[PDB]
RNA sequence: UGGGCUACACACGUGCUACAAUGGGAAGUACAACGAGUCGCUAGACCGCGAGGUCAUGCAAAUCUCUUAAAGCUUCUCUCAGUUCGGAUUGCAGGCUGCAACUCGCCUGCAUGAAGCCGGAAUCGCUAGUAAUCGCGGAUCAGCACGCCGCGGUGAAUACGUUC
RNA sequence: GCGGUCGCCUCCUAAAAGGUAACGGAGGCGCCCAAAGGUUCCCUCAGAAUGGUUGGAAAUCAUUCGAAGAGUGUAAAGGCA
């Protein structure tokens, strides 16, 4: 790789917020949180809300109701 | 490292024993990656293209080759040698770390993510991706962009056959239709 | 709108012309003049030729469809253009 | 910001969280009222803490993107069944029972001399 | 019986609401008049965010009710922003009246938040409790008015002059 | 007489060396380039299919197929991978 002339790269450690995987890969963009890391080795931080285990379909679950039919909602309206 | 090292040890035997290859040298591998962004807007203003550029040598972590126009077009009042259209290669290291944040972050951040595609597939066991918007990556930052755009993403492979490739790709992980 | 108390609104002549022919193997389409009378589950999945003034059209009833009056799905005057 | 969108920052609190789309003046009186936080302290001065707490209201709360594709899934809904309401939604009239002799502006668009 | 008179590329008349700070919002506090009322006006209480609902009271009425009017005044807040202006359109959910509210009623809550930054040629009303502005009542009327009839509140500017 | 032509370059006429006429059939020139020259090093095209945001027949990207069907400043012939 050519020198001075590629935007700064390094690397950095990723935790899922809502479940705590953690993966590490490298990115120009820099976290001032730093975490440690097996082989003793510490990197910035980047805590991420949703991950691949995070995303339901990865999962295989769905959150989502998927919504009321009409039938249903007018039953329930009308108490029929 | 992470997604090099599932390779090795996760997709390497598992490919070998579901495809029966004698050799582990038959093994698919991810060959390269090649991140397309053609910027038709630059013949408007050149600036266009340059935010662009910016924006995806911020993705990539490389700066990005800026192709131009092989051929005069008068359709989208092209002139030849225009630089209209950025790409960035990346092979090895930075070519995992890359796929594995596609995979990991910069997917789920795209709206009402439906999953990836599963029929862009050239016929020859190579993917490409279409990513309609940035901001997903999170080195965009949802506010340098002054004009939003997207991109392609060209997964190319040892893979002789799109089944291969298929398998290579979910197992990295490819949230696939 | 409709006072919930009340309840749903149907005039009973289609009301009782569906209850006839719910235990059918193959609908037949029931004619009304009736444009007030709201669409029910029971009404789903039959065709209803409804009078729009000047000729009865018919509609075919479905579970999307329950829920509004009849007569909404009826149009009564026709706009082409000018 | 909060929901997705960057809220204005010097303004009142329950007036920022206004500019969240399927929220109004009146949901964002509750939220904050939930949230214990006080209605005249701008959102820029807002601590992360209290933040994160109008986050929880509001992610419990529908918004933006969520509320714009359900009103779009009934108006879609409207004019497949081919309802009076879904031509009115497709031919750009009033759908609520209006005059359209006169006025009918918003819906029609700009007038059209001819 | 149902539909139409309620249509809708467009043109005009008459009005209502605005375009904001002489303002918007919140809280407190004060002052009218004309009129209506029997299955009608409805007190008070309770439930409801509200439209309203339940019980229930007085009154064929200078006795009871509609009916503590709104602008106003006093504080707080907003700080010139297509906005905390504007409230069209639209979604959902309700309230009534009525046999029935889709065509096609009024009203409520939440959500949305349109054009509109004071308006070309031209044109209208008004000389004082008037214009301007603020509400209140009533006739029609099951329900339904920005219209009509009437009432009061606050309350100006200008008239040199008769050439046009 | 009117019209056309007058010097130079390329093709056909031209009869497999060269040359060869007609008011015979076709076209070009009166320049351009400071690199579009020299040299060392390096590279191989045009199109087609498949896949792919804006993006459309056709902009940029990827694989395969592709011996030249491209390009070679400028006419044509000869030549050049
Ligand atoms: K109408
Ligand atoms: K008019
Ligand atoms: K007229
Ligand atoms: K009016
Ligand atoms: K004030
Ligand atoms: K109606
Ligand atoms: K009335
Ligand atoms: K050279
Ligand atoms: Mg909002
Ligand atoms: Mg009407
Ligand atoms: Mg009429
Ligand atoms: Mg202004
Ligand atoms: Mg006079
Ligand atoms: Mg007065
Ligand atoms: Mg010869
Ligand atoms: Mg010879
Ligand atoms: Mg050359």
């Not at chain 1, 820099?30 to 082989?39: A, F, I, R």
């Not at chain 2, 266009?48 to 989208?76: C, W």
């Amino acid at each position: 790789m050519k020198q001075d002339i590629h935007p700064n790269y390094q690397p950095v450690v990723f935790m899922d917020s809502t479940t705590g995987f953690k993966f590490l890969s490298g990115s120009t963009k820099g976290s001032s949180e730093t975490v440690e890391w097996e082989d003793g080795n510490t990197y910035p931080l980047l805590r991420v809300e949703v991950t691949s285990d995070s995303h339901p379909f990865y999962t295989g679950r769905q959150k989502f109701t998927q919504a009321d039919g009409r039938v249903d909602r007018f039953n329930k309206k009308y108490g029929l | 490292n992470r997604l090099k090292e599932k390779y090795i040890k996760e997709v390497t035997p598992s490919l070998v024993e579901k495809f029966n290859y004698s050799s582990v040298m038959q093994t698919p591998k991810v060959d390269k990656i090649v991140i397309n962004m053609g910027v038709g807007d630059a013949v408007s203003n050149a600036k266009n293209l340059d935010k662009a550029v910016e924006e995806l040598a911020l993705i990539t972590g490389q700066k990005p080759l800026i192709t131009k126009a092989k051929k005069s077009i008068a359709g989208f009042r092209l002139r030849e040698g225009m630089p209209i259209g950025a790409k960035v290669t990346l092979r090895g290291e930075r070519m995992y770390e890359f796929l594995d944040k596609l995979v990991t972050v910069s997917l789920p951040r795209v709206r009402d993510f439906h999953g990836v595609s599963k029929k862009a597939f050239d016929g020859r066991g190579n993917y490409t991706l279409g990513i309609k918007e940035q901001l997903i990556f999170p080195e965009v930052d949802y506010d340098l962009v002054d004009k939003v755009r997207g991109m392609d993403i060209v997964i190319v492979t040892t893979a002789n056959t799109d089944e291969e490739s298929r398998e290579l790709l979910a197992q990295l992980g490819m949230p696939f239709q | 709108g409709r006072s919930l108390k009340k309840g749903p609104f149907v005039d009973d002549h289609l009301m009782k012309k569906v209850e006839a022919q719910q235990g059918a193997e193959k609908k037949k389409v029931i004619k009304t003049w009736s444009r007030r009378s709201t669409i029910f589950p029971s009404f789903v999945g039959f065709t209803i030729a409804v009078y729009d003034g000047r000729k009865h059209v018919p509609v075919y009833i479905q579970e999307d469809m329950v829920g509004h009056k009849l007569g909404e799905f009826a149009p009564t005057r026709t706009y082409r253009g000018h | 910001r909060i929901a997705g969108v960057d809220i204005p920052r010097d303004k009142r609190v329950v007036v920022s969280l206004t500019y969240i789309y399927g929220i109004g003046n009146t949901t964002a009186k509750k939220v904050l009222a939930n949230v214990g936080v006080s209605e005249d302290v701008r959102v820029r001065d807002l601590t992360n803490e209290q933040t994160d707490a109008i986050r929880a209201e509001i992610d419990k709360l529908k918004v933006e993107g969520d509320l714009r594709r359900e009103v779009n899934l009934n108006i879609k809904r409207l004019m497949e069944i081919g309802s009076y309401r879904g031509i009115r939604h497709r031919r750009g009239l009033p759908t609520r029972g209006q005059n359209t002799k006169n006025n009918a502006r918003t819906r029609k668009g700009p007038t059209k001399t001819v």
